[PDB]
Design a protein around this ligand. Structure first.
Ligand SMILES: NC(=O)c1ccc[n+]([C@@H]2O[C@H](COP(=O)([O-])OP(=O)(O)OC[C@H]3O[C@@H](n4cnc5c(N)ncnc54)[C@H](O)[C@@H]3O)[C@@H](O)[C@H]2O)c1
Ligand SMILES: NC(=O)c1ccc[n+]([C@@H]2O[C@H](COP(=O)([O-])OP(=O)(O)OC[C@H]3O[C@@H](n4cnc5c(N)ncnc54)[C@H](O)[C@@H]3O)[C@@H](O)[C@H]2O)c1
Ligand SMILES: NC(=O)c1ccc[n+]([C@@H]2O[C@H](COP(=O)([O-])OP(=O)(O)OC[C@H]3O[C@@H](n4cnc5c(N)ncnc54)[C@H](O)[C@@H]3O)[C@@H](O)[C@H]2O)c1
Ligand SMILES: NC(=O)c1ccc[n+]([C@@H]2O[C@H](COP(=O)([O-])OP(=O)(O)OC[C@H]3O[C@@H](n4cnc5c(N)ncnc54)[C@H](O)[C@@H]3O)[C@@H](O)[C@H]2O)c1
Ligand SMILES: *c1nc2c(ncn2[C@@H]2O[C@H](COP(=O)(O)O)[C@@H](O)[C@H]2O)c(=O)[nH]1
Ligand SMILES: *c1nc2c(ncn2[C@@H]2O[C@H](COP(=O)(O)O)[C@@H](O)[C@H]2O)c(=O)[nH]1
Ligand SMILES: *c1nc2c(ncn2[C@@H]2O[C@H](COP(=O)(O)O)[C@@H](O)[C@H]2O)c(=O)[nH]1
Ligand SMILES: *c1nc2c(ncn2[C@@H]2O[C@H](COP(=O)(O)O)[C@@H](O)[C@H]2O)c(=O)[nH]1
Lengths: 390, 390, 390, 390
């Protein structure tokens, strides 16, 4: 019959909104708050949404959440918490290599299979072949980072991130090739990059994932000091679009402030999301809580801040501050998971993989927001209010 | 793994060419020769291509070919031949109603099941419930056409076409409602229309298919005489795009000169293709062969030509001429079928339904042709040549 | 082989971002904060970046930094400091000609070769043929400015700037020709201009450099009072693009607030950058430090402010205020130098000359910033923070 | 020779910026702060700029300044002051007709020629044939306004303005025709209008000038309450462009905050500028000065405010407030005159007539301003400052 024979199941579906390609073709320099995702069709419940994510070519996580390698964010405690909730943590390298290797060992010795030296309480916990938690580590691109890498490999790190503001450098590519030849099984994350040209240079060197973002971080002043960077949403879309031609996952790094930002980054092509300030002042973050006028808060600083580089003339690229206490990771990360699942349900996708497939196929639709639209989208017209997320 | 998890099976597939929507958004006023279909991916053979087509809401044919209701094209002989090759013929009404009903009866009595008054030699032959060939008939929108319709319904016609140059009229809509209430099972084809506004008016009246085309016919001079019409490719695309919102098939009528034109019309949203000149001077066309300077050819005239309307000032809308002999329908239609199948294979679709699904989804891609491109596409740079299609 | 023969060394390099010409063709009226420079490829260290800059046709400096001719900014002390750090200072003329000539003499007698009447402590110090520091001076376009010019030429000034808000005037052109005929060796800077038409008029008169900017200065209210001016980034790009057709350097004047602004101005085609407020409240700036509620700060006023013109009815074009203490030039200018070098390294250029060559060739790429993008580029999501640049 | 024969005196003059027609074709909905005028060529001094302006077809003023018919702005004192400084005042009608006629008489009896029962202290003072100051008056479009008009005509008013928010009404057109037939010599100003369609309706009725502006006034809330209006700069340009086809002058009404705004309105096609808040809290404004926390200020209210309409259900269209004391008109208006003259000198025109001629010919050029550009154009980067206009 005609109702089937005219177009074969694919029905009318009025065209309304912009595709991602149309949205990011305009060259406006958009970030997360400049656009929304239009809703789709719902025929399933939120709890059925699958958040399985690729961290690298060969490392898969049950959630897309990653803690940033920052000395005020990720040490062994935070890494264990993120592994237990289904993500991963990357241990910072603003320390001695022995200290870093000890932190990696503490992460890797939390759970064991056959000890050669709880699984039910944490179903989403990611594990390697030997029933051990996964762990990540940051290294630089200088000469001593080779010895640091040897210690980390001995400690049993599963993935290393090359920590730099501008990853498209001869130093970074040289260390990528060094690692590829000396530890052929080790997974390497390159970055940070914001353009497809940088991305091509790093993928040709053989990275297993790309870290995307420059200047969007909450503690960053790189854009205003060095005049270099890119709006985060455009950067994530462009680099993910390039990298998926070669099957390279993208980690979206910097500027994430809420669940909506996480969902937008995943919809734009990122496979995982890296969080700094959002996970600072949690119980598992390193450092100690302190009070400033009846407010509980913790230190949070950028790695390019003068205090961070203290332990010639130094050009600071980050600031040092404090953020309000958020509580425990074991209570905060489930809220993020539920929020992402609800966002996926609203846009009509059963999984993050299907979200990205719909985006690349043009089925997922977007819309811009003017300044008035953003104000309307926020809380308005109230004398006073209380905001309780969960 | 990441190779699956990044976008879920849907690979890169570099973007190249225009979608049909993009092509017909430019407002250039394109017809068939102004564009091409870009090739796709082939993983099947040409003979496996399915050409099942919807003529109306409830009438399905094995091929998309229809013979036009013209007194130099379709009588009982042509109708039987087209039914036997898998299409259908529409018997013209430039005759008395008794003559038309007799032609319909001759078509409907060619093959029988249980005669109440070969099926393997012609596998593609379309048949109704009682194993009889299908037949179509044209009627006008004047008062006496009701009596003509009664005679045709008694003769057992399966579908009637309302024959007019401009179908968006109060007369046509009145007769559509008359037919709907008096013969609730009879299928009605409305037209001719070239715009979505006309199409909406006719679909609201309850037609089961639309006949699309005004001024594109080979014998027609309506565009130059009445300044009204539309380029055929744009008309087919626009009207099919509107009509498929309601599950109404479109017959593309006029200006078809070759297999490439048939394939283009089907790719643009038409479900069947109506042919005039292409089927004139076949053996089954009415009239007798005659010679003019060693060339065998037959009369072919437009219904709005003065000779056609002869049997008060008449404004002619068509010319009368002759076309070269093509041979038999039973040998010519298989060539068209094979050509359409090869076109479908080249663009990478298993069926006409899938062709249209790909076009509406944006997977099928198109390209414009300049005048130099069209010349290049034709035969060139030769001293002399012979063109043998089959 | 094909890897070389296909395109000869020039590899793919995916296209991403806008060229400067594309960015400033849109007519949006951009200034510095509306765009960023995308990062390039790094294969050298920051300290290897060469900042040699052309102040005029024949005067070359080792850094691109120039102090503005303002009575709260540049006197002999500031001029000596800027000469010693590799730049130059322009002595203001809101004084008597004898006072100005004495300041020029004090600058020119700081270092000597063969005295006819430290080289290692300051390697970047600019010097003339006779091992003396270079010095600049401002003059007006009125009649007595000829006598002022005679005194300055006797004092041995190396370059004079014609000080005006709108340099495209018959008065300015007359004085330019006067100076060219009377002091054929003296270098003349014309301005201020913001359009290529003004620039053509001044280059035809024979200037050796152009001063670009109108209304962008921190103390300026010309745009709001006289409705005339231009956004600074667009002005710098347009005028530099015109002036380089004739080999005329451009000084970018006004609205510089940080190292990122300096880098952007140099990337847009300027050869040197003139600074007002950024160098006010340094130790070498004229005037005395004073306290307002525990904050140390110095007077800073525009030359078109009523206080400035006090020493008929006067239309003020500038305001008078105070800015916070910055410390010494000998410590602040090295920070600017290091910042510019780091910006050049990030965008992948070995020198300012190569930065501009990449920009004109289209290799350097830019990106716009929405308001949300600018907010994201700034410090955000923090309860409190401290910003220590160096 | 070729230097003349190639193009005949008209030289290259590089193309840079936008014409007014290009600027206002974009449909962005610009007001005064969204654009600047680019500078031109200066070959004359500021005092030589001629500000002669057409108020109506037959009434010419030496300055383009007009005081608004508002009960907190214009009574006899303000009307006399504006006439003496070269402009005109329009006496408000929120009073009895006898009171209004008495104010008109007080204005018309200030200076006399041959008294039927100083002119060198005020050279710019506008005068009629009998050496008397000109005076304007506002009337409504209701029935009793005819009697009010009779009293005003007897008092000797020279021009009447029809006071309404939306002037394109049958009531306004009826009163325009009434006035034209009963007082054939009286000059009538119609409005307020913001579109060319309204302008055509009023010009067809026979107005001698148009009052342009709806919702832009400082005390107005019409746009937010009735959703109707237009950005003032676009409104002035569009309506002036239409009205000059018929030789009808335009008064730009509302939203003027400074000299730059006046200059922009005149450059966009207006012949005179009407001022409300800018002239409120001057000594000559009606009402009494009063103090609020050490600040001297005066009442200023919109005519559509509830207090104004007090003396069944009233929809307020204006608010009531207070503005800071500005001093005397005799000192403030000369500042405006000098500012306008300086703006004309900067853009390179000898007169307002030549400003508009250059604008219509495309020689005058404009530029847009982003939000960052506007911030840059303002005062910035200062700890504190003092702004003394004159
Ligand atoms: N993502 C961001 O936007 C961002 C911005 C600023 C800082 N940061 C963080 O701050 C930290 C440091 O910043 P960075 O990017 O300057 O790190 P970095 O230490 O890589 O850079 C230091 C400098 O040394 C150079 N360098 C690097 N390797 C070298 C080698 N082998 N030989 C010679 N020179 C070499 C670099 O090009 C750079 O000029 C990192 O944690 C980084 O992630 C991040
Ligand atoms: N598709 C084309 O481009 C095209 C163009 C011209 C002619 N033709 C063919 O030629 C033939 C005649 O052309 P036509 O369209 O003029 O046919 P038509 O007979 O419908 O038109 C005849 C005229 O009579 C009017 N009319 C129709 N029904 C009426 C009624 N009940 N009462 C009063 N007036 C009425 C029509 O509006 C038209 O003016 C048809 O075969 C048509 O298919 C086709
Ligand atoms: N760059 C800017 O945006 C800007 C803006 C305002 C003021 N300023 C500074 O403030 C100071 C004020 O200078 P200015 O440009 O306001 O005015 P200026 O000192 O050049 O002269 C002011 C007026 O005198 C006229 N004039 C100049 N030379 C003349 C001559 N020979 N004969 C007759 N008339 C002549 C000018 O055209 C102008 O109307 C300067 O320091 C200037 O650099 C700079
Ligand atoms: N944007 C502006 O320029 C603006 C906006 C609001 C108010 N105002 C000022 O406030 C005052 C009043 O505003 P307004 O425009 O409502 O004045 P208005 O008195 O003309 O309007 C009063 C109402 O009566 C109607 N009306 C007018 N004449 C009539 C007649 N002869 N018969 C029947 N109905 C008639 C009008 O259409 C309107 O609905 C005026 O001073 C006006 O200038 C100005
Ligand atoms: C600029 N960016 C910096 C610096 N240190 C780290 N970073 C980047 O910021 C991310 C965290 O940002 P949040 O918005 O707080 O999530 C980090 O992951 C890293 O990429 C710095 O000093 N200057
Ligand atoms: C214009 N068009 C006419 C006329 N009679 C019929 N037609 C239309 O032409 C079609 C055939 O065109 P070909 O190109 O030869 O296939 C018919 O089906 C009909 O729609 C006429 O008089 N003037
Ligand atoms: C407007 N602009 C003025 C005035 N005096 C000087 N200037 C200009 O400003 C520049 C300094 O600006 P900063 O942003 O503080 O660097 C000067 O170099 C000069 O060009 C004035 O009165 N009104
Ligand atoms: C809206 N607009 C009103 C009202 N009364 C007068 N007006 C308009 O505003 C102009 C003055 O505006 P300023 O910006 O203060 O110069 C007047 O001339 C008139 O056109 C009102 O109640 N609501």
């Amino acid at each position: 019959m005609a109702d089937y024979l005219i177009s074969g199941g694919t029905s009318y579906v009025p065209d309304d909104g912009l595709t991602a390609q149309q949205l990011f073709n305009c060259g406006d320099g958009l970030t997360y708050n400049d656009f929304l995702i239009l809703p789709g069709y719902i025929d399933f419940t939120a709890d059925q949404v699958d958040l399985t994510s690729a961290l690298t070519k060969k490392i898969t996580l049950k959630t897309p959440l990653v803690s940033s390698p920052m000395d005020t964010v990720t040490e062994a405690g935070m890494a264990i918490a993120m592994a237990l909730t289904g993500g991963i943590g990357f241990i910072h390298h603003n320390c001695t290599p022995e200290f870093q290797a000890n932190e990696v060992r503490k992460v890797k010795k939390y759970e064991q299979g056959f000890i050669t030296d709880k699984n039910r309480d944490y179903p989403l916990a990611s594990k390697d072949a030997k029933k051990q938690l996964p762990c990540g580590a940051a290294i630089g691109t200088h000469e001593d980072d080779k010895y640091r890498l040897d210690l980390l490999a001995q400690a049993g790190v599963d993935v290393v991130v090359l920590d730099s503001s501008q990853g498209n450098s001869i130093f970074q590519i040289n260390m990528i090739k060094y690692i590829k030849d000396k530890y052929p099984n080790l997974q390497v994350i390159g970055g940070n990059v914001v353009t497809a040209a940088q991305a091509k240079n790093l993928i040709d060197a053989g990275v297993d994932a790309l870290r995307v973002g420059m200047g969007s971080g909450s503690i960053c002043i790189t854009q205003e000091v060095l005049a270099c960077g890119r709006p985060q949403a455009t950067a994530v879309y462009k680099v993910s679009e390039y990298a998926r031609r070669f099957g390279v996952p993208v980690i979206a790094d910097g500027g994430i402030q809420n669940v909506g930002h996480i969902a937008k980054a995943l919809a734009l092509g990122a496979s995982t999301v890296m969080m700094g300030s959002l996970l600072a002042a949690t119980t598992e973050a390193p450092g100690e809580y302190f009070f400033s006028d009846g407010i509980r808060l913790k230190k949070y600083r950028g790695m390019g801040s003068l205090d961070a580089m203290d332990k010639k003339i130094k050009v600071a690229q980050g600031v040092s501050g404090a953020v309000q206490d958020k509580g425990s990771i074991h209570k905060f990360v489930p809220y993020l998971i539920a929020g992402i699942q609800h966002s996926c349900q609203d846009i009509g996708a059963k999984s993050l993989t299907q979200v990205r497939a719909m985006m690349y196929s043009g089925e997922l639709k977007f819309e811009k927001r003017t300044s008035s639209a953003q104000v309307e989208g926020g809380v308005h017209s109230l004398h006073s209010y209380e905001k309780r997320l969960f």
